[PDB]
């Protein structure tokens, strides 16, 4: 509530962006002027072809210096961020001067007080003088991107204008190309054959890297840009930190009846060359990522924002959750269910009742009742969800109405359907599984059943490519990659006439039988010098799409019975995994940030401060199976939601007056745990391990 320079600068930049958007909207109506303007309004002027060219030259002349200002500032900021990222991977992480150190957190520096003002300015000035002559080695640069809000509005306006003008086989087969969920705009994707799996798709090798705050770069590989050496400024990679040097390069590369109105087509030309917004987005990728991270609440609220279009997990999950809440509260039809705690009668009653209920849906609430057990809270539905998940994922038999439904293709913790000579019972079971996942997505709960990436991509309606095979079976993915890499060797037929592979494959026991051909005419066509890409793509689409087409279609129809075709649009496999299955493993930091610590004992042992520390040390020193049993004792679910908005009751630990006689009690429907205050840390640990087993 005080006067500041930055507030006025941001407000003036917002006004400038509004006027630039209006100018862009006015210039976009020129080729359809006589249809949209000179057919409805009684008063309009006459527009010729040469006047549009004069207007385009006028506007391109009057937006030069702000363009130079923005490009110089963004180039210097991207150079500083890229040098910081380069120095982060070449230095010692144990040093306090490292970028990935705990001392570099801004919130940790404020909490540590409970350096001087001269030293901060002296370090800023010393970083300013060293950056002029490229003398800034082994020093982290001093900058604040959060004070650059007025630059982002001008950048957004100019990208809006550029985007508005722009929009107005063997190896080169569309199976080995990544989709939009794994590429970067304006950047060259990595080579799928010459790069091993450890540094191309690190999410396939390490599935535990999926976090709600995880970046895209460390999950799908490092992109590259082919910009070096070329005389224009936009064709050279920005490596200099100085604003003056970048401004010097920008200016030096700067000053280095007729046709009908329908045929007018503007072209973007600032610096003597055609400019696309894709290479501008790829040129400043780190700055755009940080701008989307820190400037979404105000800069990202503008109409036609490029930060919202390039949003991550938190942008899409909020929109999906509010649409789910609106569609849930739109109708008032309830669903009731009665089950019992076993396997066979549980799955039989589930199939019967889910067939009887709409044998799109408009389910408002879901109520579950256990037979010969009390309880009517919201945690009973979560207990039913984890019970039906562990019942479907278990491997004993098929409980009448024969193969087990799911199997693991080679990665632990992920499942794919087994066809097993599909009758009407298996298809109805898969439709029921899809409807169960649909109601779990609708009711804001977590169903602990985990599918592979291609299984999720079939449900969402996305094309399966060669890179999805790494999430199916990684070792033979690597073996086939080495087979492609050896298929282009200089010896050629020397390695081809060694094993003499054919176009028939021996399937495993779960997939079916064996000796199944890929192409017509069967085994009599061996591997030629040039057929290997075709053999790989037919093998991949046979093992991912041909064997289990009917269960995937049944699950897609079951998911579409509850959810419409307007919510799965602009969703990905990873946020589908994060919204249904949660975060997977259980961490301590989010569980710390979710708790409330209600106090009702009234006891003042050093104002507590030691029982809570002992409790969190007990949780941090606990095995993950016991952690999942702990979380099952909180809210009757083995997994945590991805964010705070997945908890309709907030989690709560509530202390009690001290009594060393009873185990802590659980109220599942309000997500509360009443714990009595104890004395010894070992006593607390023993009581917790005895309470979690139940």
């Amino acid at each position: 509530n005080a006067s500041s320079y930055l507030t006025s600068a941001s407000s003036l930049a917002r006004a400038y962006s509004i006027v630039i958007r209006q100018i862009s909207d006015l210039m976009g109506l020129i080729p359809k002027y006589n249809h949209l303007v000179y057919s409805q309004i009684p008063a309009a002027v006459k527009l010729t072809y040469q006047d549009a060219v004069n207007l385009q030259n006028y506007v391109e002349e009057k937006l030069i210096p702000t363009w130079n200002w923005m490009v110089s500032i963004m180039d210097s900021t991207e150079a500083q961020l890229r040098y910081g990222s380069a120095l982060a991977s070449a230095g010692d992480p144990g040093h306090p001067n490292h970028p990935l150190h705990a001392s570099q957190n801004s919130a940790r520096r404020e909490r540590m007080t409970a350096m001087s003002a001269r030293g901060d300015f002296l370090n800023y000035a010393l970083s300013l003088m060293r950056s002029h002559n490229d003398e800034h080695s082994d020093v982290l640069p001093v900058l604040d991107v959060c004070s650059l809000k007025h630059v982002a509005y001008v950048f957004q306006a100019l990208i809006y204008w550029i985007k508005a003008m722009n929009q107005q086989t063997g190896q080169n087969h569309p199976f080995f190309r990544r989709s939009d969920s794994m590429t970067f705009l304006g950047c060259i994707p990595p080579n799928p054959f010459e790069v091993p799996l450890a540094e191309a798709i690190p999410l396939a090798d390490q599935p535990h890297l999926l976090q709600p705050n995880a970046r895209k770069e460390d999950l799908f590989g490092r992109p590259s840009q082919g910009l070096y050496s070329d005389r224009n400024c936009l064709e050279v990679l920005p490596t200099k930190m100085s604003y003056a040097a970048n401004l010097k390069n920008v200016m030096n590369m700067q000053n280095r009846e007729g046709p009908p109105l329908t045929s007018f087509r503007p072209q973007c030309s600032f610096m003597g060359m055609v400019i696309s917004h894709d290479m501008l987005l790829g040129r400043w990728r780190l700055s755009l990522e940080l701008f989307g991270r820190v400037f979404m609440e105000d800069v990202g609220a503008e109409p036609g924002s490029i930060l919202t279009e390039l949003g991550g997990f938190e942008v899409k999950e909020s929109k999906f959750r509010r649409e789910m809440e609106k569609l849930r509260n739109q109708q008032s039809r309830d669903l009731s269910l009665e089950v019992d705690r076993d396997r066979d009668l549980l799955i039989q009653q589930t199939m019967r009742q889910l067939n009887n209920h709409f044998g799109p849906m408009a389910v408002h609430r879901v109520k579950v009742t256990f037979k010969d057990e009390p309880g009517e809270g919201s945690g009973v539905a979560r207990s039913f969800y984890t019970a039906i998940a562990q019942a479907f994922l278990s491997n004993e038999k098929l409980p009448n109405l024969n193969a087990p439904l799911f199997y693991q293709p080679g990665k632990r913790g992920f499942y794919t359907p087994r066809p097993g000579k599909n009758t009407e019972a298996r298809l109805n079971c898969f439709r029921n599984i899809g409807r169960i996942l649909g109601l779990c997505l609708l009711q804001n709960e977590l169903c602990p059943i985990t599918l592979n990436r291609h299984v999720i991509k079939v449900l969402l309606g996305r094309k399966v490519n060669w890179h999805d095979f790494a999430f199916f079976d990684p070792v033979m993915y690597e073996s086939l990659r080495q087979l492609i890499l050896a298929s282009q060797s200089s010896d050629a037929d020397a390695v081809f006439s060694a094993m003499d592979l054919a176009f028939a494959i021996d399937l495993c026991k779960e997939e079916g039988g064996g000796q199944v051909e890929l192409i017509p005419n069967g085994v009599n066509i061996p591997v030629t010098p040039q057929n290997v890409y075709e053999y790989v793509r037919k093998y991949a689409e046979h093992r991912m799409l041909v064997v289990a087409e009917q269960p995937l279609h049944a699950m897609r129809k079951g998911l579409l019975d509850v959810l419409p075709k307007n919510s799965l649009e602009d969703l990905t496999a990873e946020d589908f995994r994060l919204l249904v299955n949660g975060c997977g493993e259980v961490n301590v930091q989010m569980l710390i940030s979710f708790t409330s610590f209600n106090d009702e004992s009234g006891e003042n042992a050093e104002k507590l401060l030691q029982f809570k520390r002992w409790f969190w040390s007990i949780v941090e020193k606990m095995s993950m199976t016991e952690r999942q049993d702990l979380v099952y004792f909180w809210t009757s679910s083995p997994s945590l939601p991805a964010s705070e908005e997945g908890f309709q009751p907030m989690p709560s630990i509530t202390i009690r007056p001290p009594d060393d006689q009873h185990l802590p009690t659980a109220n599942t429907c309000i997500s509360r745990l009443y714990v009595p205050l104890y004395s010894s840390k070992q006593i607390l640990k023993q009581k917790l391990l005895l309470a979690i087993k139940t």
Binding site: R108, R215, F597
Partner: peptide, 30 residues
């Protein structure tokens, strides 16, 4: 230590610097 042991109820008054990733945390303040 330094890490808080409970929720702070978000305290309002946010500048967005806490939403920065761990790799780019040295480039933001407050």
């Amino acid at each position: 230590l330094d890490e808080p042991l409970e929720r702070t109820t978000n305290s309002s008054h946010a500048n967005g610097a806490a939403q920065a990733p761990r790799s780019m945390q040295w480039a933001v303040r407050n």
